[PDB]
User: Which sequence fits this backbone?
DNA sequence: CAGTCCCTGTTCGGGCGCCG
DNA sequence: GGTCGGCGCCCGAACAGGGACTG
């Protein structure tokens, strides 16, 4: 067997474990013909070699159809091998995005063929890549081969190819520094500001460099004219857009269908502004079977119809200009949903996106806005390596009030206010000093762990009092209920004294939404008030009326 | 031609496998130039995917510095080699360093590049340089010499370092010299003038062996933040409730605290804004509690076998308080920072500055870095903290969310 | 007292999308 | 078909830790 011009990556097994020894699956006669035709062809080219009985290893093998071609692809079920092979550190840290490309004079795209089959495998590792090819007769012993190149299906093949490919391109990139080469597996976006004459020269120069190592650049995949098809996109000299997206039009929707639906809507939200998947993802909660038909809700059918109406119109993105600033603007779409657009010139979006996570049981719009800014910042640093300036639908004074009084550290990068309703604001402010002339409510609540019963009420300085029996509750729900009662039966200004750290920690965070209906009712009463002062006192210390109301709600 | 000191991980533990976070453009260009230079001087060499280990890497600029500095987050590797730099080749900590009038820090990390690393251990110093928009796959390297920021580097170089410092330690015996990570702490009771001169004498004493920095500290002027009670002449119901709550919380630290006579003033169901006169038995319980807060806590002392822990509380208006302890309510040291860089505009910058100041103090006093309990959300911290870091070490931290209880550490 | 117990947050594992 | 790796999303479950109360 000849020596491959590329250096080979030394691969070991995990210490203590032997090679795979698994029996072959029964294969259909149409797949056996496709395998023997490709096996006999790869053994002529030095990519697989015959092995005898001295090789005690074996692994299954099969073949699937290639997309839009009569050719077949050979795949090996290395699931038992991959378990015992050594761990690899992948060198693919993410996916390039067209919004990060810079305008270049000339652009060329090429794709080498049979990429993994042009890179050798380690010599001392070829023994564990043994597999059997079942013949047309079940009694025929079958032909056993072992791989000489990177087997499609092994966990080290992509890692090894990406690193081997970068090593071959370094001498070219070292001699041609002004040439931009986007390397993603077997695909090379090549672009330069050189004139179109010396461009094609450097392309051919690359096509020969690569050829010296057994990497073929077929003219079938060569692309010299715009638009270019790269990474699911359509690259034009001034704009870009995603490859057409097709949503299913199922009359009866299954879970698996929504999952494919949600997945393509998320992919479309990168340049299609305003895609919402809130009500469609609400169909995937608490469901157990991809084989479970699910009816569309009224809010989900509306959300789908809106998204279909956005995909009808054509949208496009632009490229990155390092000379001008980066700008990102956020809007408040729906409750728990946010959208943004990143651009450098107005209405010429580099890309769009959405953020909708709900973090926590209790939160407000200011928290979610801060989470969205951070998601945009990280995403921006990935693609452009800088933080955009931000246009936020929150008043400067609103944000200054929040971060200065919040107990956690919080910060937003350089930003400016944009008046685009709905505006993010704080719905209520707890006073810092007790209110003069306001009735003072000493609240408490307790429950029994066993009976699940409890009381909650209050005692005031004006003689007012209330106690309410509660069924199927906890100690925390009662302490919250006691505060809800004091809010109900008080005027516009009220001082409230509790001994519940749990209740006080929730309200001081100024939430405007919650997963608990009792909290939402407390919030609604807090918005109606003009002045509210909350205070905490230690329990069981004989403090004020807090000990008098602790004894009323004791049982 | 130097012999390599054999190093091994702690038994039953693999190397670090931490993903590289995204880096800005100005950082990646700085790492490329440095790494290309360090490769040309043979300090590092390119590797491949067969190495399953990786450690994050980013760059910094020290205080009032224009040049970038390569920094590796070897916190995970240092945890997995802890038995080496503590048992076999430990460094003693001078208890007199914290008593000097002036202490100066010197980056001596460039000297570690003169000593080769053990061949079998180079596999764990692996790191990856990312690219903008993921143009190219990860450019991986590994160290061929003693890496900066690894705890095993100052322990191996310790024998070489002592021989360089002996001619200077002999001429200046009253000067205390401590070595932590890539820094060298030199403290002296001399006047500020001749102190800086002796630093330059050392600086040239290290330049002749094949090695520059300047950051002055004054540990004798380090103060602590006690628990203080308000000195009001007219007390309202609300004031007395806040006072009892604070005294109740402080009773976990000073067992002698009593709130019996003050709680008696909170018998009736009174309005919060109503003024209450202090009884005679209460005015004495308040003055006695003020004297107990003047006394030091009983039974508090540093344990070298225990990990330090630090908590930070945002007090607003650029105020930040902190406490260092090993066992709860046994605070070895409390304090408060104010008017740091980024006050009244940025909270992550202030929190980053406070951690650095606290860690620096922990190195001078105990020679250890505490594990921080940071008052911030993880994602907020992990997004911005690298943009304000100006130090060659990185402490450990965790994220807490404790709502303010009753302002115990700040009035 | 150490043990639950009530609550809240995090981590992970399992789907789909996209790319090669 | 039921191969690999990368990234993104969305959900549930499983795990973790911190309180408060009670045997």
Assistant:
């Amino acid at each position: 067997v000849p020596i491959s011009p590329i250096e080979t990556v030394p691969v070991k097994l995990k210490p203590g474990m032997d090679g795979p020894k698994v029996k072959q699956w029964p294969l259909t006669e149409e797949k056996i013909k496709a395998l023997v035709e490709i096996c006999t062809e790869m053994e002529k080219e030095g990519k697989i070699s015959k092995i005898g009985p001295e090789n005690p290893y074996n692994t299954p093998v099969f073949a699937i159809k290639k997309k839009d071609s009569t050719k077949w692809r050979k795949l090996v079920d290395f699931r038992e091998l991959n378990k015992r092979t050594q761990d690899f550190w992948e060198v693919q840290l993410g996916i390039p995005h067209p919004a990060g490309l810079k305008k270049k004079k000339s652009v060329t795209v090429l794709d080498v063929g049979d990429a993994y089959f042009s890179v050798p495998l380690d010599e001392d590792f070829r023994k564990y890549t043994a597999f059997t090819i079942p013949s047309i007769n079940n009694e025929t012993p079958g032909i056993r081969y072992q791989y000489n190149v990177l087997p499609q299906g092994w966990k080290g093949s992509p890692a090894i190819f990406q690193s081997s490919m970068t090593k071959i391109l370094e001498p070219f990139k070292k001699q041609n520094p002004d040439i931009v080469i986007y390397q993603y597996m077997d695909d090379l976006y090549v672009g330069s500001d050189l004139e179109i004459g010396q461009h094609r020269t450097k392309i051919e120069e690359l096509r020969q460099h690569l050829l010296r190592w057994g990497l073929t650049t077929p003219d079938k995949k060569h692309q010299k004219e715009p638009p270019f098809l790269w990474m699911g996109y359509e690259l034009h000299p001034d704009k870009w857009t995603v490859q057409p997206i097709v949503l299913p039009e199922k009359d009866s929707w299954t879970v698996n269908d929504i999952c494919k639906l949600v997945g393509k809507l998320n992919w479309a939200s990168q340049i299609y502004p305003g895609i919402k998947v809130r009500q469609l993802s609400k169909l995937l909660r608490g469901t157990k079977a991809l084989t479970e038909v699910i009816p569309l809700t009224e809010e989900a059918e509306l959300e789908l119809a809106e998204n279909r109406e956005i995909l009808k119109e054509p949208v496009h993105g632009v490229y990155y200009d390092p000379s001008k600033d980066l700008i990102a603007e956020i809007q408040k779409q729906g409750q728990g949903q946010w959208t943004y657009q990143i651009y450098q010139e107005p209405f010429k979006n580099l890309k769009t996106g959405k953020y909708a996570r709900m973090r926590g049981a209790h939160t407000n719009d200011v928290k979610q806005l801060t989470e969205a800014v951070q998601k945009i910042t990280t995403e921006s640093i990935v693609i452009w390596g800088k933080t955009p300036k931000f246009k936020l639908p929150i008043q400067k004074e609103t944000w200054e009030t929040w971060w200065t009084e919040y107990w956690q550290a919080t910060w937003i990068p350089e930003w400016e206010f944009v008046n685009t309703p709905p505006l993010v604001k704080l719905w209520y402010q707890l006073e810092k000093e007790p209110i003069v002339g306001a009735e003072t409510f000493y609240v408490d609540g307790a429950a029994n762990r066993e009976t699940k019963l409890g009381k909650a009420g209050y005692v005031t300085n004006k003689g007012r009092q209330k106690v309410v029996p509660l069924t199927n509750t906890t100690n925390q729900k009662t302490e919250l209920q006691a505060i809800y009662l004091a809010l109900q039966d008080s005027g516009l200004e009220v001082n409230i004294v509790t001994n519940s750290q749990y209740a006080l920690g929730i309200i001081q965070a100024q939430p405007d939404k919650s997963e608990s209906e009792l909290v939402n009712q407390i919030i609604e009463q807090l918005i109606k008030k003009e002045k509210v002062y909350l205070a905490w006192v230690p329990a069981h210390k004989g403090i004020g009326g807090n000990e008098q109301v602790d004894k009323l709600v004791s049982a | 031609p130097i012999e390599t000191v054999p190093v091994k991980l702690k038994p039953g533990m693999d190397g670090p496998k931490v993903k590289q976070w995204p880096l800005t453009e100005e950082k990646i260009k700085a790492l490329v130039e440095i790494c290309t230079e360090m490769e040309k001087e043979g300090k590092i060499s390119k590797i491949g995917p067969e190495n399953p280990y990786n450690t994050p890497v980013f760059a910094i600029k020290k205080k009032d510095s224009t040049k970038w500095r390569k920094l590796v987050d070897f916190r995970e590797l240092n945890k997995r080699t802890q038995d080496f730099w503590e048992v076999q080749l430990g460094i003693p900590h001078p208890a007199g360093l914290k008593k000097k009038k002036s202490v100066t820090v010197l980056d001596v990390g460039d000297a570690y590049f003169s000593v080769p690393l053990d061949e079998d251990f180079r596999k764990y110093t692996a790191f990856t340089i990312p690219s903008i928009n993921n143009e190219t796959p990860g450019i991986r390297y590994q160290y061929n010499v003693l890496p900066q920021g690894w705890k095993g580097s100052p322990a191996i170089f310790q024998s070489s370092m002592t021989k360089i410092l002996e001619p200077f330690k002999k001429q200046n015996p009253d000067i205390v010299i401590y070595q932590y990570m890539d820094d060298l702490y030199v403290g002296s009771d001399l006047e500020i003038g001749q102190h800086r001169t002796k630093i330059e004498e050392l600086r040239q004493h290290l330049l002749r062996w094949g090695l520059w920095m300047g950051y002055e500290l004054h540990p004798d002027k380090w103060t602590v933040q006690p628990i203080v009670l308000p000195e009001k002449d007219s007390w309202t119901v609300n004031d007395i409730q806040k006072l009892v709550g604070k005294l109740n919380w402080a009773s976990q630290i000073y067992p002698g605290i009593k709130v019996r006579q003050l709680s008696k003033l909170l018998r009736g169901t009174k309005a919060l804004t109503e003024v209450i006169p202090l009884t005679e038995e209460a005015e004495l319980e308040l003055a006695e509690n003020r004297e107990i807060l003047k006394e030091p806590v009983h039974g508090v002392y540093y344990d070298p076998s225990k990990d330090l822990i630090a908590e930070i509380q945002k007090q607003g208006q650029g105020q930040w308080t902190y406490q260092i302890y090993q066992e709860p309510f046994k605070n070895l040291k409390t304090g408060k920072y104010a008017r740091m860089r980024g006050a009244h505009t940025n909270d992550v910058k202030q929190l980053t500055e406070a951690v650095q100041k606290i860690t620096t103090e922990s190195i001078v006093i105990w020679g250890k870095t505490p594990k921080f309990k940071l008052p911030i959300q993880k994602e907020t911290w992990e997004t911005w903290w690298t943009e304000y870091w100006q130090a060659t070490w990185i402490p450990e931290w965790e994220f807490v969310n404790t709502p303010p209880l009753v302002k115990l550490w700040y009035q």
In short: The two ends of chain A are 87 Å apart (CA to CA). Residues 157-175 of chain A form the longest helix (19 residues).
